């Protein structure tokens, strides 16, 4: 998977990147730790399902949303993405299955999990 | 990040010293004037997609291989590098998002940037 790479980064890494590159920016809405930071750092941000540019470029989903239709749709966008494993946590997944998850993502994309050892785990899963 | 440093050489700086030491030296075949130096220096080179040994130790990438894709190859490698900032101009990032992205590299790195004042930005940025 040549468009797709891995790394750790913390929230505000990600947000200093997606708000510099407007990459697009999957967020699960009922993650609140990751709300609560994006409401505080983009004031007056309205927060709703899809695509809000505002501070940076989200996508915001619900985990009722199943991780195949959000991929599908991510892939409809054809946007650059930076984002978490998806499915991972939210869906009760663990890591191996949302990375099972993700080799269907057809769009390029950063993937930013947890630590350096969980880079070289999540991409023997994904290969 | 103790295993990387950031020194000011130009492209034939940067050729010499990877021909002695063989490290393994990343090169963005999108970016027509190394590419054109590469084949002056070491005639008769065949240029392709990967490690390239001949003259000296290449990575041949394009950019259509995400930044942290590159990252993950190379850190799977194992290969001590000599290296510009990965992304920085070749994938539309500037020096500070190159920066973010080169934190992910786990071999050893000597990174040349273009001036003895982006040294002082690179290593501003990379922490
Ligand atoms: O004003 C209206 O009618 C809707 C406004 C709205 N707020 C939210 C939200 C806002 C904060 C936290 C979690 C949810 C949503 C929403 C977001 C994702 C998926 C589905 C719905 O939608
Ligand atoms: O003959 C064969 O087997 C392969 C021929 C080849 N030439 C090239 C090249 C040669 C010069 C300039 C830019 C590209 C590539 C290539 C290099 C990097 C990434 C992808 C492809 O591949």
Same mark, same amino acid.
């Given at each position: 998977?040549?468009?797709?790479? %891995?790394?750790?980064?913390? /929230?505000?890494?990600? *947000?200093?990147?997606?708000? $510099? =590159?407007?990459?697009? &920016? +999957?967020?699960?809405?009922?993650?609140?730790?990751?709300?609560?930071?994006?409401?505080?750092?983009?004031?007056?941000?309205?927060?709703?399902?899809?695509?809000?540019?505002?501070?940076?470029?989200?996508?915001?989903?619900?985990?009722? %949303?199943?991780?195949?239709? /959000?991929?599908?749709? *991510?892939?409809?966008?054809? $946007? =650059?993405?930076?984002? &978490? +494993?998806?499915?991972?946590?939210?869906?009760?997944?663990?890591?191996?299955?949302?990375?099972?998850?993700?080799?269907?993502?057809?769009?390029?994309?950063?993937?930013?999990?947890?630590?350096?050892?969980?880079?070289?785990?999540?991409?023997?899963?994904?290969?």
């Amino acid at each position: 998977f040549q468009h797709m790479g %891995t790394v750790s980064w913390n /929230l505000r890494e990600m *947000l200093a990147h997606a708000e $510099e =590159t407007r990459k697009l &920016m +999957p967020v699960c809405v009922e993650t609140k730790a990751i709300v609560s930071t994006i409401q505080r750092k983009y004031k007056g941000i309205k927060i709703q399902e899809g695509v809000v540019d505002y501070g940076a470029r989200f996508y915001f989903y619900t985990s009722k %949303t199943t991780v195949a239709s /959000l991929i599908n749709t *991510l892939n409809d966008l054809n $946007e =650059t993405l930076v984002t &978490m +494993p998806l499915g991972y946590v939210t869906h009760g997944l663990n890591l191996e299955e949302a990375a099972r998850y993700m080799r269907s993502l057809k769009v390029p994309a950063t993937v930013s999990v947890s630590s350096p050892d969980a880079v070289t785990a999540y991409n023997g899963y994904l290969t």
